[PDB]
Amino acid sequence: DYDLIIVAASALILIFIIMMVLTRAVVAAAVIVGTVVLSLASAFGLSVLLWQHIVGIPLHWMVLPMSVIVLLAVGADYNLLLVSRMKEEIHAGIRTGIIRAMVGTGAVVTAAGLVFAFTMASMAVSSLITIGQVGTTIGLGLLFDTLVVRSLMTPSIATLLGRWFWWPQRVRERPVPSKWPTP
Amino acid sequence: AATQEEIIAGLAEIIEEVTGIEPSEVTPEKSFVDDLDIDSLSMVEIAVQTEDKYGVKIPDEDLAGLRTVGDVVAYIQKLEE
Amino acid sequence: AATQEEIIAGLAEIIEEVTGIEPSEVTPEKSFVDDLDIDSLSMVEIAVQTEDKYGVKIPDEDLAGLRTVGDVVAYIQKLEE
Amino acid sequence: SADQRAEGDASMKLIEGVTFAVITVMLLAVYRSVITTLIVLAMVVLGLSGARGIVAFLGFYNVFGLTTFATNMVVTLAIAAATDYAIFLIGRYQEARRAGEDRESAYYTMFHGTAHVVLASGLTIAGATLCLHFTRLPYFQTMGVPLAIGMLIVVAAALTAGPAVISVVSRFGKTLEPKRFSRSPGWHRVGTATVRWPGAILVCAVVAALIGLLALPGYYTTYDDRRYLPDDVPANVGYDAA
Amino acid sequence: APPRPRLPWFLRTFAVPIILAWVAVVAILNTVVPTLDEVGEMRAVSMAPNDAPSTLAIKRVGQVFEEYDTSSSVMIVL
Numbered sequence A: 001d002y003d004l005i006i007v008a009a010s011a012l013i014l015i016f017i018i019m020m021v022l023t024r025a026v027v028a029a030a031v032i033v034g035t036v037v038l039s040l041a042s043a044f045g046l047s048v049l050l051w052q053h054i055v056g057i058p059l060h061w062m063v064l065p066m067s068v069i070v071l072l073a074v075g076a077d078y079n080l081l082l083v084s085r086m087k088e089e090i091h092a093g094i095r096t097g098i099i100r101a102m103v104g105t106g107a108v109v110t111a112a113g114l115v116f117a118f119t120m121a122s123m124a125v126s127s128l129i130t131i132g133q134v135g136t137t138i139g140l141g142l143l144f145d146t147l148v149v150r151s152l153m154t155p156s157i158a159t160l161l162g163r164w165f166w167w168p169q170r171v172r173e174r175p176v177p178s179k180w181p182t183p
Numbered sequence B, C: 001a002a003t004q005e006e007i008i009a010g011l012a013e014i015i016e017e018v019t020g021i022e023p024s025e026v027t028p029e030k031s032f033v034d035d036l037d038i039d040s041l042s043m044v045e046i047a048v049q050t051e052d053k054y055g056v057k058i059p060d061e062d063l064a065g066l067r068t069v070g071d072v073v074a075y076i077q078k079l080e081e
Numbered sequence D: 001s002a003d004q005r006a007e008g009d010a011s012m013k014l015i016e017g018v019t020f021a022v023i024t025v026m027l028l029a030v031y032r033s034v035i036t037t038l039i040v041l042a043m044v045v046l047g048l049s050g051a052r053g054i055v056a057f058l059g060f061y062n063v064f065g066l067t068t069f070a071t072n073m074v075v076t077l078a079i080a081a082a083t084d085y086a087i088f089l090i091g092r093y094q095e096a097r098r099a100g101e102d103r104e105s106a107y108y109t110m111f112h113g114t115a116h117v118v119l120a121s122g123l124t125i126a127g128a129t130l131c132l133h134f135t136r137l138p139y140f141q142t143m144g145v146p147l148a149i150g151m152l153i154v155v156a157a158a159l160t161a162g163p164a165v166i167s168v169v170s171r172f173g174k175t176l177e178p179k180r181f182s183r184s185p186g187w188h189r190v191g192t193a194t195v196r197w198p199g200a201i202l203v204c205a206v207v208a209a210l211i212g213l214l215a216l217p218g219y220y221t222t223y224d225d226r227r228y229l230p231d232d233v234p235a236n237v238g239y240d241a242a
Numbered sequence E: 001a002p003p004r005p006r007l008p009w010f011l012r013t014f015a016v017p018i019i020l021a022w023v024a025v026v027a028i029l030n031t032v033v034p035t036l037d038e039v040g041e042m043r044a045v046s047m048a049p050n051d052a053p054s055t056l057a058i059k060r061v062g063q064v065f066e067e068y069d070t071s072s073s074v075m076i077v078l
């Protein structure tokens, strides 16, 4: 119990510091961390269901911290990749920037996330069932993160916050309107 | 205001980015649903791009009404005037 | 519309209230950053007062662009026209 | 406990084989290119071998202790991270190529756009696992340093040998060129939906995420390790007899 | 000419030496010492810390009764 608390706190603080340093923004780092935490809760629920209710073998007492320490980091990495692309595409307007960033990264990030999830889930063929439980929990977590948090939650929050998503940096919501081109 | 040619050129560039249809294909008598084969989601993407570049806001209810390129050009000119 | 003199008089009164600079100092060729020494927060205060008195809305992004009193007067006249 | 360690050490080869098979299948599905898959597999093998080699070398000279969980996690994490970094680099390079840039400019665009992201991801993974060093149970604590060192080695390999391999191979024929040129209508639709109507989509996503909390009230754990082992281990035979 | 950055240029110009160095180092590391399985087998760590009250209780019983000094036991069934 105490180790799980310590690991969660330290990992969250370190990931927040790294994201704040890289993106040069506070609100973006907070959004990344919060979305990852929510995905973590969903992952725990799915894994508990799949094992305890379906299979019948409850989770081992050491599955939770091992799963958490990896889910946090990998989810944060994927969100960081998307946000980093968004920052490069943002000079054309927040909404168009988000659309271009999603079109650019989506396939790559989906392939990487699926590969990671199916690599983790392949540990279930082990004779030791604790390792299988850890692997399947991390796999379900990354699956849910990739398919929901990055695809829907993060860009929705970025659109809703608007210019506050990049605080304390100063960002135009939309560019200066331009004259129609002459053919 | 802006001439029909300028609006058509800008919309053709945006449509090229969104869908890939070449600008030469976009003529004011083309129907989005049939001639150009553009679904409603692509149309709302075009509206978002237009609002973020030229500052023209097109609500979804109006997007339902618009049928051909000429209709969109007329709508934009009406807003400008 | 409103003549440049009227806009300058109103802005001078508002600037006098916000910062204390006398109206005689405010001339259209003065730079806020250097000549008048007005920081950005004072400028947003001026924008708030202008919006609440004469109904002219100036977003912050535009406030960044504005440099001299003449620029603000031109912006207000453009909005009025 | 002895049988638990024995089974953990026994199943490692099978785990590695299955992971490699699954990775090869998925890479073939994604890239549609055998040569691209072979290049990615070479990168993954280099990274994994470096990680396991450095961990084994440091462990042999009593720098730190080891457990079966630590070794399994090291292997799987190294494989996954190496594959992810290869996918990121090659994806950015192929996007630049498909845009129209030549191979030199495509390589430089790839590096400029993904160098910092790969490093940041690797540092997050390394620093997260290193927080296990501050726990009290030896099983958790002995995972911090090994995992961190392995992740650092994998990241260094991906950031130095990765670009080198990409630079060398792409020159020798049409190797890393995009096999299937196609845009992303699905991602266009998802982006437009997320931009136009963010409130509804956010509501749906948050509702979906909170569904998992319903499993919390019924959660419980057990400490009997004979439930987590196959029935043919000697300990389970003795337990059945007793 | 575009000012190419130093780092990617260095990686591109000396790619073959870098690849060879990496392969050589990895092979040396995997050859000098045994496999990870044997090292993990011979470097296993005790599950319970010495601060654990149960371990201290068992060792205390062992030393007070002057019988043993460990904390782990097995049962033989006939």
Ligand SMILES: CC(C)(COP(=O)(O)O)[C@@H](O)C(=O)NCCC(=O)NCCS
Residues within 6 Å of the ligand: B039, B040, B041, B044, B060, D193, D197, D200, D201
């Ligand atoms: C999205 C769209 C414009 C697409 O129209 P189409 O069916 O003509 O392509 C139309 O379905 C619509 O107005 N829907 C109402 C709001 C909506 O669909 N939001 C997205 C659901 S999360």
Ligand SMILES: CC(C)(COP(=O)(O)O)[C@@H](O)C(=O)NCCC(=O)NCCS
Residues within 6 Å of the ligand: A170, C039, C040, C041, C044, C060
């Ligand atoms: C407030 C200000 C206009 C001041 O600008 P200055 O640095 O030019 O004085 C600028 O910092 C800004 O737009 N900040 C973004 C929003 C903000 O600062 N809100 C207050 C923080 S609680």
